[PDB]
């Protein structure tokens, strides 16, 4: 049944936000906002673990998080992601552990990933 629901999902057109992550020598929480008209919505969130004493790490690839349903709420069709005429942009408010503080953006910007169905 698990693989049944999984195969089901790959049969839908999906949109992701790609995050290259690495040790910033401190833990932090990464909030994702995609802004259409400079109107912003809380789309999703990422957490990062780390410490003063840390083993420096860089991910081999980027973690994905699907904005697929979030886009459906804003009624901006997946097709408009390709259109320069239509206005959409991606923004992240990186916020540290102690609060706020907040970190100036030390994490590379997210990318839109369109995964067409099979």
């Amino acid at each position: 049944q698990l693989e049944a629901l999984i195969q089901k999902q790959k049969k839908a057109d999906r949109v992701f936000a790609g995050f290259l992550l690495h040790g910033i020598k401190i833990s932090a929480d990464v909030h994702l906002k995609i802004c259409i008209e400079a109107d912003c919505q809380e789309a999703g969130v990422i957490f990062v673990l780390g410490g003063e004493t840390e083993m420096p790490w860089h991910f081999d690839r980027n973690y994905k998080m699907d904005i697929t349903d979030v886009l459906k709420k804003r009624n901006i069709p997946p097709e408009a992601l390709f259109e320069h005429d239509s206005k959409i942009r991606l923004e992240v408010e990186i916020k540290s552990v102690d609060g706020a503080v907040l970190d100036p953006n030390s994490l590379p910007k997210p990318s839109l990933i369109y995964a067409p169905a099979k």
Partner: protein
């Protein structure tokens, strides 16, 4: 199957067909070499080997001449393939100015790389087996004369074929086609009874097929001209003659053993050579001109009042050279020489039309008008001449053709063709050098420094305010291919604006290199008059901000490969071409491109070793023209692989955002297209939007189709890979 230029062949390709030819030739059977060399002429197998009256089989002086020889060339091709050559029968341009025969068929011997033994070159000689004397083919005597005197404005062979491509009707094209081709036969043959002077034994000499691979390609060129011209390309002028079964090929299983050629012994379906015969050519470029470029030249040609000397050429048994003289007063003038190819047992032949020979510039240099009183003198000399009476051939007549066309304007006002700087003519070289000076001469916005300055620290990112600065050249590197697509376009367009009719050339570094192209290495060059150094393709270029010349000192390499494997760059690009989605390609794509930047970029920081100063050396234009070419090869591969080519689905963030420096209109850059097509999504489709096509998309001798097989053959291997996670550092670093 790919038929290439003889010069374009790598030593691998050169050796592999040498062994194939060697095997095909060495050992004699009905499926062997001799049996095929005997198809064309003199064992006299037509109409039948039986009985009393027999003449040479090959068709000449008829509209089916090219059809016939297309089959023979195909026979030779299949025979070589079957014996282990990956390549179709190669061709050599005689249209290219040449002093002597190419090394492939010139050398008596060659060294075997594996055995390290020097054995006979199969293409220099060839035995003649049906006689019992032997050997005895000998192309050794070359007639008068290779570079001059014959015609020419210029190149004997080039002019005649230009005129041939000009004609609308098939037969009109065919006469000029064949009789021009006839010359190089008699020219290379000489006084020798064998080896291409005589119709009888011409096909025994191995040059014959390399020769007619070219001839065939020329027809293919004319055919593509006609579809662009929008007119019928089949042989309707001689419709009945297409249904006559090609004489030696149509024969039954003992006499001819090739399936493909026997099915097509009726040439009606021979026209579509790619479908029916399963081969093609590396380029259909004639001279330096593309096919669209080719129709232009004949228009400039067809706009003049021209006068011709027309010859009706019918079969006289011997093969003969006639020298044409224009005599308008007292002494006469040599206007040229044409050759008629034949033999004692030749199949009786006669042209329906007349062969037109240009004689237009004979008149001018004689101080004589078109309509002044003049005779034509011919002296007919046999190749074994023993010169012939002038009556052997019916007297020439002069034909007058008034200027004609208004086919302008033309949709290729925007169209360009990018070729190799290693392949350029001295005439084309000077044309590029002068054009670039004016490009360099302009120091502000419409000039060369500005487009080079987009690699500079000038701050357009962000704006109007930007609080802290960095260079605005696109890297990162997802959109790297797109931006340089536009940079190389700006470099091109600005260079076109300054008196040039061509597109921005490139150089193949996938292939091995001895030194930089002739266009770049030298500080000083000689114009037609003779000139001091402009240059302006030496690294010398003033950066207004830095106030210096961007000097480029070479490095210790670059020539590593042995017989077995490709150059390191070729290996890299293959791995880059492998990838399915765009980004996985892009990473490999450019990391490979970073090489030369660091290779011609020596110790000196003013060189293109640094991406800040990089673009001020003009080789950058050549580099990222070729870099852009690879990106285009890929796009064709993606189409071949049935996957997205003029779009992509990764890194949409940067792919939908207009470039920083190109999107800042209108004060900052003059280009209409880079302004309109600044979004990476728009710059994907280079064919429709930027109106330029490349020379070839072939990579290191491998066509796109072969490339995919090679890409697939490698993927069958069980292989390990080491991966590198790369971040941007200010230094320009070599990492081993």
């Amino acid at each position: 199957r790919f038929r290439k230029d003889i010069s374009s062949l790598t030593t691998e390709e050169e050796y592999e067909l040498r062994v194939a030819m060697e095997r095909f030739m060495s050992d004699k059977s009905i499926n062997g070499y001799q049996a095929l060399a005997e198809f064309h002429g003199l064992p006299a197998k037509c109409p039948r080997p039986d009985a009393l009256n027999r003449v040479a089989c090959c068709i000449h002086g008829m509209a089916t001449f090219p059809h016939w020889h297309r089959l023979v060339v195909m026979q030779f091709e299949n025979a070589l393939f079957t014996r282990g050559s990956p390549i179709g029968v190669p061709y050599w341009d005689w249209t290219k100015p040449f002093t002597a025969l190419p090394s492939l068929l010139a050398d008596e011997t060659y060294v075997d790389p594996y055995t390290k033994e020097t054995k006979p070159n199969p293409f220099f000689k060839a035995p003649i087996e049906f006689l019992k004397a032997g050997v005895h083919t000998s192309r050794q005597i070359d007639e008068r004369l290779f570079k001059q005197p014959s015609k020419g404005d210029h190149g004997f062979l080039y002019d005649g074929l230009s005129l041939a491509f000009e004609q609308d009707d098939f037969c009109d094209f065919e006469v000029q086609f064949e009789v021009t081709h006839n010359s190089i036969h008699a020219w290379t043959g000489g006084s020798e009874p064998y080896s291409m002077s005589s119709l009888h034994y011409t096909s025994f000499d191995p040059m014959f097929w390399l020769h007619h691979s070219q001839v065939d390609r020329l027809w293919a060129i004319w055919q593509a001209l006609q579809i662009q011209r929008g007119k019928p390309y089949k042989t309707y002028c001689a419709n009945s003659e297409v249904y006559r079964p090609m004489k030696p090929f149509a024969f039954k299983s003992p006499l001819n053993n090739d399936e493909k050629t026997r099915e097509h012994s009726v040439p009606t379906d021979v026209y579509d050579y790619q479908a029916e015969l399963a081969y093609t050519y590396d380029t259909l470029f004639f001279g330096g001109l593309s096919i669209r470029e080719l129709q232009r030249y004949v228009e400039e040609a067809k706009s003049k009042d021209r006068v011709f000397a027309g010859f009706l050429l019918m079969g006289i048994q011997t093969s003969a050279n006639v020298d044409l003289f224009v005599v308008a007063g007292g002494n006469e003038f040599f206007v040229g020489s044409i050759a008629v190819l034949g033999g004692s047992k030749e199949m009786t032949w006669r042209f329906d039309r007349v062969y037109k020979h240009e004689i237009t510039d004979a008149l001018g240099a004689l101080g004589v008008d078109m309509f002044a009183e003049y005779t034509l003198r011919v002296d007919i000399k046999d190749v074994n001449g023993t010169a012939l009476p002038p009556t052997a051939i019916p007297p020439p007549i002069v034909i007058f053709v008034p200027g004609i066309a208004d086919a302008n304007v033309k949709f290729d006002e925007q169209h360009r063709s990018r070729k190799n700087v290693d392949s350029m003519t001295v005439s084309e070289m000077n044309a590029l050098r002068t054009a670039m000076a004016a490009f360099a001469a302009d120091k502000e916005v419409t000039g060369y420094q500005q487009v080079a300055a987009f690699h500079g620290s000038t701050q357009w990112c962000p704006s109007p305010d930007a609080a802290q600065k960095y260079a605005c050249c696109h890297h990162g590197m997802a959109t790297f291919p797109h931006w340089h697509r536009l940079i190389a376009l700006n470099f091109e367009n600005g260079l076109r604006r300054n008196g040039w009719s061509g597109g921005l050339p490139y150089w193949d570094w996938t292939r091995p290199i001895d030194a930089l192209p002739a266009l770049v290495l030298e500080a000083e060059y000689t114009d037609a008059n003779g000139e001091a150094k402009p240059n302006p393709f030496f690294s010398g270029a003033i950066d207004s901000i830095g106030a210096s010349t961007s000097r480029a000192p070479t490095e210790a390499l670059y020539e590593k490969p042995d017989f077995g494997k490709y150059t390191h760059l070729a290996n890299e690009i293959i791995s880059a071409l492998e990838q399915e989605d765009f980004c996985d390609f892009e990473v490999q794509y450019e990391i490979a491109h970073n090489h030369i930047h660091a290779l011609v970029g020596g110790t000196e920081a003013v060189s293109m070793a640094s991406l800040e100063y990089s673009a001020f050396d003009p080789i950058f234009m050549l580099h990222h023209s070729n870099v852009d070419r690879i990106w285009a090869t890929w796009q064709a591969l993606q189409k071949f692989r049935g996957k997205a080519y003029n779009s992509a689905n990764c890194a949409i963030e940067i792919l939908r955002k207009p470039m920083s420096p190109f999107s800042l209109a209108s004060d900052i850059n003059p280009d209409a297209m880079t302004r309109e097509y600044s979004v990476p999504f728009d710059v994907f489709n280079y064919k429709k939007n930027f109106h330029y096509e490349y020379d070839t998309l072939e990579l290191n001798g491998l066509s796109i189709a072969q490339l995919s097989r090679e890409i697939n053959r490698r993927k069958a291997k069980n292989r390990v890979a080491v991966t590198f996670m790369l971040e941007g550092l200010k230094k320009s670093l070599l990492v081993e």
